[PDB]
């Protein structure tokens, strides 16, 4: 009754952006990445692939609430590199090692005879 | 055929004007349940 | 070959049994997370109920009309209501399906999954057809009926996801084990007497080299290897299930980059 | 009331598994853990879906209309 | 899941784990006011002064009732019925304020006078929501 709707977990609102960017003040060369209508399935991927980059200084995810499907992603680099794009290139790692995952999973059940 | 109201016991359709007495066509029972809507009612599948 | 490895153990139409090795075990949860919860599925969405005399309430039935599987092999060939551009439901984005069942004979008389039938056109893809896995090929028996008792419904089966509500759930219970032998010391385990007596030995210990007292803990070790067992409930085939869960995985981070992009536009 | 389609904690169908279930212990004479084992409910919360289910319908099937 | 609170798996209420259902019957008679001075149970409008609801009496079918399918709501009158006063002053049940659901069975009967007695029951799913106690 005071319930929301399903949908409104993954289904993006009026003028609700998937990316919000803000610098983080309290650090030089940090950003932090408000992802609406998401959660870990996500957001630990992320965090984890981000963790993988040298050039990362800090990497962190949280779930500020559980009502809501959003999460804030603080991410701080080395100078003279974009957080933007260590998240950019930590994305790329995760869909070329799925799309790898996806290759030879594919090759193993062709290989499956029940 | 026209539906209006239907029998409990015997369940015969029954079918009565207001003030046409309440009890029942074949068996004389007093007690009657209403139609139900031809208006088509609808619900989600969760 | 290239990158996280995969090694089948066991298959069949309903379970996938199988290795992760050399993946990161947030990437290993987050497809688990992934084949449950976010891939696309086609379910009853709206009953219109015609007529009822079941002892069994129109919302009762309703909710078990949903719960029913029914075909999703080419899901990504009907669209998401939603993004369709009709008022309400079409063939593009929906599968129309009729339920019509009434108690002639005197014994007690069953409605099942398979007395369903599709009045929307198909355009040729295998959707909306009724799941049956069942010996005597009924399917899921919605209800029983008496005499006079009738049951006569319109459903609108529709694409969706288990975020939605778990009827658009293609995953039954997922297994999930790593580090069989407790070796990276990422549990404690409570005990009266003896830690490895008391708690029980797992299949997978099988596959995994034990300790041996005299060795050193490594704290070097990380984790990676990780035992699965996918179970379709039948709406999409098992292997699809750990595909299409890969590749809704990757549609997701794609999206992010693709949303990325459009930021670096102002 | 009626067998309900799908254990609830992991969506595993139960529902088509009901008279199959019965059969296993009537006619086959089999006893309720063997049966469900053999039905395939492995994990125990598919196992108290059917095994712990009241099939109530039957008794209210009984009355006339 | 603290103090005395839980976590429920919402996969499982889904599948319809600890879902009730809920009715709740309102009745009414066409009380005699003495000899020939009866109430009637009907379909009401605005005819001279008559203290009508603020619910949809729509609603009701002619002989005052709702129809048993039909979705009824806040205080959507679910029984239409008007005393004399010497035209017609309203009589009519809404339902109640903090409720909703469907029609699920009307019964229109007799009282041992001999006078129209009715009782309507409607019918509500309840789901486990996150107040909700076990
Ligand atoms: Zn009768
Ligand atoms: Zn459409
Ligand atoms: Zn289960």
């Given at each position: 009754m005071n319930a929301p709707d399903?949908?409104?977990?993954?289904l993006l609102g009026?003028?609700?952006?998937?990316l919000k960017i803000d610098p983080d003040?309290?650090?030089?060369?940090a950003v932090v990445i408000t992802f609406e209508k998401?959660?870990?399935?996500l957001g630990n991927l992320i965090r984890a692939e981000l963790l993988?980059?040298?050039?990362?200084l800090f990497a962190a995810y949280k779930?500020?609430?559980?009502?809501?499907?959003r999460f804030k992603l603080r991410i701080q680099t080395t100078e003279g590199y974009d957080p933007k794009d260590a998240l950019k290139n930590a994305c790329n790692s995760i869909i070329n090692k799925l799309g790898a995952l996806k290759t030879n999973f594919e090759t193993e059940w062709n290989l499956q005879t029940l | 055929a026209t539906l209006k109201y239907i029998c409990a016991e015997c369940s015969s359709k029954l079918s009565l004007s207001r003030?046409?007495?309440?009890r029942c066509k074949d068996c004389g029972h007093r007690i009657l349940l209403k139609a139900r809507t031809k208006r088509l009612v609808q619900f989600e599948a969760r | 070959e290239e990158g996280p490895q995969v090694k089948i153990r066991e298959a069949s139409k309903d379970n996938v049994d199988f290795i992760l090795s050399n993946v990161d075990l947030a990437m290993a949860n987050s497809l688990r997370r992934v084949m449950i919860a976010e891939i696309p599925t086609l379910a009853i969405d709206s009953v219109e109920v015609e007529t009822n005399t079941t002892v069994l309430a129109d919302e009762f039935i309703a909710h078990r009309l949903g719960l029913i599987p029914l075909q999703?092999?080419?899901?990504?060939?009907?669209?998401?209501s939603r993004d369709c551009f009709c008022e309400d439901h079409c063939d593009k984005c929906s599968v129309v399906l009729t339920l019509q069942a009434f108690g002639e004979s005197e014994s007690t008389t069953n409605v099942y999954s398979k007395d369903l039938v599709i009045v929307?056109?198909?355009?040729?893809?295998?959707?909306?057809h009724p799941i049956i896995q069942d010996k005597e090929g009924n399917?899921?028996?919605?209800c029983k009926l008496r005499k006079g008792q009738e049951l006569k419904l319109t459903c609108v089966a529709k694409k969706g996801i288990a975020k939605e509500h778990?009827?658009?759930?293609?995953?039954a219970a997922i297994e999930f084990e790593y580090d069989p032998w407790n070796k990276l010391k990422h549990t404690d385990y409570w005990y009266e007497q003896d830690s490895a007596k008391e708690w029980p030995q797992s299949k997978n210990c099988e596959y995994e080299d034990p300790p041996n007292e005299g060795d050193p803990f490594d704290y070097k070790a990380q984790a990676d290897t990780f035992y699965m067992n996918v179970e379709s409930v039948?709406?999409?085939p098992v292997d699809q299930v750990v595909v299409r869960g890969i590749d809704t995985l990757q549609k997701k981070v794609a999206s992010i980059l693709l949303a990325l992009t459009q930021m670096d536009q102002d | 009331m009626i067998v309900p389609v799908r254990c609830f904690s992991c969506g595993k169908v139960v529902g088509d598994k009901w008279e199959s279930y019965l059969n296993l212990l009537?006619?086959?004479?089999?006893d309720e853990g063997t049966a469900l084992s053999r039905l395939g409910?492995?994990?125990?919360?598919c196992r108290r879906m059917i095994?712990?289910?009241?099939?109530?319908i039957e008794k209210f099937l009984r009355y006339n209309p | 899941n603290q103090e005395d609170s839980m976590i429920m798996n919402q996969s499982s209420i889904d599948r319809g784990l600890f879902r009730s259902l809920f009715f709740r019957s309102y009745m009414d008679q066409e009380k005699?006011?003495?000899?020939?001075?009866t109430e009637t149970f009907e379909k009401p409008?605005?005819?001279?002064?008559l203290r009508m609801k603020?619910?949809?009496?729509?609603?009701?079918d002619d002989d005052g009732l709702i129809a048993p399918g039909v979705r009824v709501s806040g205080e959507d009158v679910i029984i239409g019925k008007t005393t004399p006063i010497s035209s017609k002053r309203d009589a009519s049940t809404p339902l109640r304020s903090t409720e909703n659901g469907i029609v699920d069975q009307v019964l229109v009967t007799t009282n041992q006078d001999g006078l129209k007695f009715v009782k309507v029951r409607v019918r509500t799913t309840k789901i486990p929501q996150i107040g909700d106690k076990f």
């Open positions: 399903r949908f409104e977990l993954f009026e003028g609700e952006s998937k003040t309290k650090a030089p060369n998401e959660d870990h399935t993988n980059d040298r050039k990362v779930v500020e609430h559980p009502f809501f499907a | 003030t046409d007495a309440v | 999703s092999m080419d899901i990504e060939q009907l669209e998401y929307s056109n198909l355009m040729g893809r295998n959707i909306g399917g899921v028996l919605i778990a009827k658009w759930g293609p995953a039948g709406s999409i | 009537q006619e086959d004479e089999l409910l492995k994990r125990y919360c095994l712990t289910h009241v099939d109530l | 005699k006011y003495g000899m020939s001075i409008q605005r005819t001279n002064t603020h619910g949809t009496y729509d609603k009701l």
